[PDB]
Amino acid sequence: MQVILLDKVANLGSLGDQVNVKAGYARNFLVPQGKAVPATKKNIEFFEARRAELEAKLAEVLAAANARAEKINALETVTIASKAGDEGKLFGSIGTRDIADAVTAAGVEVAKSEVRLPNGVLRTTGEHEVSFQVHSEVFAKVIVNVVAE
Amino acid sequence: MKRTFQPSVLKRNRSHGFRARMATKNGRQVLARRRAKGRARLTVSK
Amino acid sequence: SRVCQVTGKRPVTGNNRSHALNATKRRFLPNLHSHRFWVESEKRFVTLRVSAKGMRVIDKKGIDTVLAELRARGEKY
Amino acid sequence: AVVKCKPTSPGRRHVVKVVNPELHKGKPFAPLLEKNSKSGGRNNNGRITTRHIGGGHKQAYRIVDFKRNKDGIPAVVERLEYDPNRSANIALVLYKDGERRYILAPKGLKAGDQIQSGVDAAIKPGNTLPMRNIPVGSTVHNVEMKPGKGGQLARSAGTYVQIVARDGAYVTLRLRSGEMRKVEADCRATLGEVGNAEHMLRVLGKAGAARWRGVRPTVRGTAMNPVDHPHGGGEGRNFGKHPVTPWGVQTKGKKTRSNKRTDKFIVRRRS
RNA sequence: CUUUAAUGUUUGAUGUUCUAACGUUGACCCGUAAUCCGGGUUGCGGACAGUGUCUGGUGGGUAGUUUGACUGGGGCGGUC
RNA sequence: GUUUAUUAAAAACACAGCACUGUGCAAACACGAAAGUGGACGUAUACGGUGUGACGCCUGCCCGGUGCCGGGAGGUUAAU
RNA sequence: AGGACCGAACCGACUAAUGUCGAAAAAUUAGCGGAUGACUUGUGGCUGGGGGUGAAAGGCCAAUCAAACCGGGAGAUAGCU
């Protein structure tokens, strides 16, 4: 399927290139998320007219805003006190709900889907590293030290 | 010697009554056929 | 029923022939599936029971155009 | 306790009874009861779908709390009761907050025993904890397929499962059938073994005993005519055929599991 | 041409990971005084399962049929 | 105890018990073009199928053939 | 306590005789089995024909069952009377 790309696709993203893609890939991922628009002999003239450069800056500022946001908290440290068990066996596994809420209350205002946990769900008690992706090409590292209560 | 026919008004009406026929389309066709034949008694009427 | 909501494909009866040409009645069924299509005009997902051919039709045309035809058909989606 | 009754008359000679002196001698707790209309093996179409079902004593349904979601509330075992719907006895438990509930009774329970749920619970039998907090190698019962589903394994009298290994977020359990199944660590389980382990020692004695238990007589395929069963026919007990189900499927050693969806959670099969 | 090897091409089998199709007879909220159904949030599986078209195997579970004539009755045997 | 209402009440059928086999729960299986329902508001000390038929002594040898279960060296093998 | 014992109602039908254009399209008379249970019964529901139901006889499904009844294809076909 010949489609025009808006966002930077890591593999074949080139700002509106007539590059074939699987129908399922565009149908289920690109179009619903706004990363591309189906163009068939009608929007090509339109893309090169108003999408050619007008939205290029609009897309870029989103990346610039994301880069600004992820540096809001220079400390980049998260401390949460949990009533862990006796010698391990933390009370209960916690994912993104509590940590995101605490960070939002005091720290960086970020959405739920932004937080990614590469080291499980924080089972063991101690120091852990969490990779935050505010953009495809922007990755952030945050150290979390859960302390037993 | 118990015989096949053991009368019961409630069972007769609820089985072959007018409203029983109208419930289904097959019963409605039964009434339609008997109207065409001109039968005086459309169904078993109490 | 097994009716595509886009192309209108419905099961069609037919025969299946053996080596001895014996004929037995069969039925051909459309390749129907339940799919959710994202519509930007109304900003939500719409679930349609569409065939694989219909899904190709939706891709070739616009989802908005297909929805308009469905509305003109007079059947709720 | 297992008691052998004297053969005062035929039908009592082979009766072996199981008597539990601590079972409650009275009516059950009404608020937790519900009617249980029999079906006789018929489905919504009215046809017989399961054979050899019908009749039997009327029995009410006890709402047994399998989920055990009352976290952090200590509870006390009021009494043990006979449940007609289950092989295992149930226990009526009163929570500190004034709520009564029914739970399966493990082997160790007795009147006045203390039980607790939630992760912050002890290791004594009767407490329910997520399987992540349960030490490996312990015996549990009433295990959950999925978090919050309720509990489906080791529910009969004298049944249990073994926790053998814990990898990542999944746990491996050995079921009473000898099969190893992989389950999520978030699922809850109850420590200990289901009680009434002597329930298997009864013999029912006579034909009427199985009759008022809801079981109807079973007729052998050979005794039937050819038109009714794949077996049957001929003069003088002729079989000359491979054993099969009434609907033609080959029984006596043919595997019928065809799922391809839950196979990822099966580590070993029965042997 | 026989004998071998750097980058790029078609690639297909296998393996790992991901989520956005799809499944959910998991939980929670709403329509709603509702164990149906739908929508929403989340969890778990996940391109698997399942379904359509085509195709190999199995298939008395079911169906339609066939199972000759002569003959010192017929059958058996023999013959055509 | 049940059975050929209306020529057969029995040694037939059932039976408690016994064994084999299938089934991990969206269970096997059954009725349904499907939804769904029974199994079961049960889950392996449970459920379905099959044979034998209380209880006591027991139940020997044979895997060639046909089924069923497992294997993969090699050969043959459809659609495409 | 008991699918315990004897025995009426009640349920069933082992033997004999009568009756076979009968009082009766399976009965009567005299005996006979069970009779607190796998019992029996009233009322009302559910299962529909290649289907139901069946402690299994090819039994029963309105006096009809190795495929009910009614209408239709249909004036089926009949090398036979």
Curated annotation (Swiss-Prot), chain A:
<dbReference type="InterPro" id="IPR009027">
    <property type="entry name" value="Ribosomal_bL9/RNase_H1_N"/>
</dbReference>
<feature type="modified residue" description="N6-succinyllysine">
    <location>
        <position position="83"/>
    </location>
</feature>
<comment type="similarity">
    <text>Belongs to the bacterial ribosomal protein bL9 family.</text>
</comment>
<dbReference type="InterPro" id="IPR000244">
    <property type="entry name" value="Ribosomal_bL9"/>
</dbReference>
<feature type="modified residue" description="N6-succinyllysine">
    <location>
        <position position="71"/>
    </location>
</feature>
<dbReference type="Pfam" id="PF03948">
    <property type="entry name" value="Ribosomal_L9_C"/>
</dbReference>
<protein>
    <recommendedName>
        <fullName>Large ribosomal subunit protein bL9</fullName>
    </recommendedName>
</protein>
<dbReference type="InterPro" id="IPR020594">
    <property type="entry name" value="Ribosomal_bL9_bac/chp"/>
</dbReference>
<keyword id="KW-0007">Acetylation</keyword>
<dbReference type="InterPro" id="IPR020069">
    <property type="entry name" value="Ribosomal_bL9_C"/>
</dbReference>
<dbReference type="GO" id="GO:0070180">
    <property type="term" value="F:large ribosomal subunit rRNA binding"/>
</dbReference>
<dbReference type="Pfam" id="PF01281">
    <property type="entry name" value="Ribosomal_L9_N"/>
</dbReference>
Curated annotation (Swiss-Prot), chain B:
<dbReference type="GO" id="GO:0005737">
    <property type="term" value="C:cytoplasm"/>
</dbReference>
<dbReference type="Pfam" id="PF00468">
    <property type="entry name" value="Ribosomal_L34"/>
</dbReference>
<protein>
    <recommendedName>
        <fullName>Large ribosomal subunit protein bL34</fullName>
    </recommendedName>
</protein>
<comment type="similarity">
    <text>Belongs to the bacterial ribosomal protein bL34 family.</text>
</comment>
<dbReference type="GO" id="GO:0002181">
    <property type="term" value="P:cytoplasmic translation"/>
</dbReference>
<dbReference type="InterPro" id="IPR020939">
    <property type="entry name" value="Ribosomal_bL34_CS"/>
</dbReference>
<dbReference type="GO" id="GO:0003735">
    <property type="term" value="F:structural constituent of ribosome"/>
</dbReference>
<keyword id="KW-0687">Ribonucleoprotein</keyword>
<dbReference type="InterPro" id="IPR000271">
    <property type="entry name" value="Ribosomal_bL34"/>
</dbReference>
<comment type="subunit">
    <text>Part of the 50S ribosomal subunit.</text>
</comment>
<dbReference type="GO" id="GO:0022625">
    <property type="term" value="C:cytosolic large ribosomal subunit"/>
</dbReference>
<keyword id="KW-0689">Ribosomal protein</keyword>
From Swiss-Prot, chain C:
<keyword id="KW-0687">Ribonucleoprotein</keyword>
<dbReference type="InterPro" id="IPR034704">
    <property type="entry name" value="Ribosomal_bL28/bL31-like_sf"/>
</dbReference>
<dbReference type="InterPro" id="IPR001383">
    <property type="entry name" value="Ribosomal_bL28_bact-type"/>
</dbReference>
<comment type="subunit">
    <text>Part of the 50S ribosomal subunit.</text>
</comment>
<comment type="similarity">
    <text>Belongs to the bacterial ribosomal protein bL28 family.</text>
</comment>
<dbReference type="Pfam" id="PF00830">
    <property type="entry name" value="Ribosomal_L28"/>
</dbReference>
<protein>
    <recommendedName>
        <fullName>Large ribosomal subunit protein bL28</fullName>
    </recommendedName>
</protein>
<dbReference type="GO" id="GO:0019843">
    <property type="term" value="F:rRNA binding"/>
</dbReference>
<dbReference type="GO" id="GO:0000027">
    <property type="term" value="P:ribosomal large subunit assembly"/>
</dbReference>
<dbReference type="GO" id="GO:0002181">
    <property type="term" value="P:cytoplasmic translation"/>
</dbReference>
<dbReference type="GO" id="GO:0005829">
    <property type="term" value="C:cytosol"/>
</dbReference>
<keyword id="KW-0694">RNA-binding</keyword>
UniProtKB/Swiss-Prot annotation, chain D:
<dbReference type="GO" id="GO:0032297">
    <property type="term" value="P:negative regulation of DNA-templated DNA replication initiation"/>
</dbReference>
<dbReference type="GO" id="GO:0005737">
    <property type="term" value="C:cytoplasm"/>
</dbReference>
<protein>
    <recommendedName>
        <fullName>Large ribosomal subunit protein uL2</fullName>
    </recommendedName>
</protein>
<dbReference type="GO" id="GO:0003735">
    <property type="term" value="F:structural constituent of ribosome"/>
</dbReference>
<comment type="similarity">
    <text>Belongs to the universal ribosomal protein uL2 family.</text>
</comment>
<dbReference type="InterPro" id="IPR022671">
    <property type="entry name" value="Ribosomal_uL2_CS"/>
</dbReference>
<dbReference type="GO" id="GO:1990082">
    <property type="term" value="C:DnaA-L2 complex"/>
</dbReference>
<dbReference type="GO" id="GO:0016740">
    <property type="term" value="F:transferase activity"/>
</dbReference>
<dbReference type="GO" id="GO:0022625">
    <property type="term" value="C:cytosolic large ribosomal subunit"/>
</dbReference>
<dbReference type="GO" id="GO:0002181">
    <property type="term" value="P:cytoplasmic translation"/>
</dbReference>
<feature type="compositionally biased region" description="Low complexity">
    <location>
        <begin position="38"/>
        <end position="47"/>
    </location>
</feature>
<keyword id="KW-0687">Ribonucleoprotein</keyword>
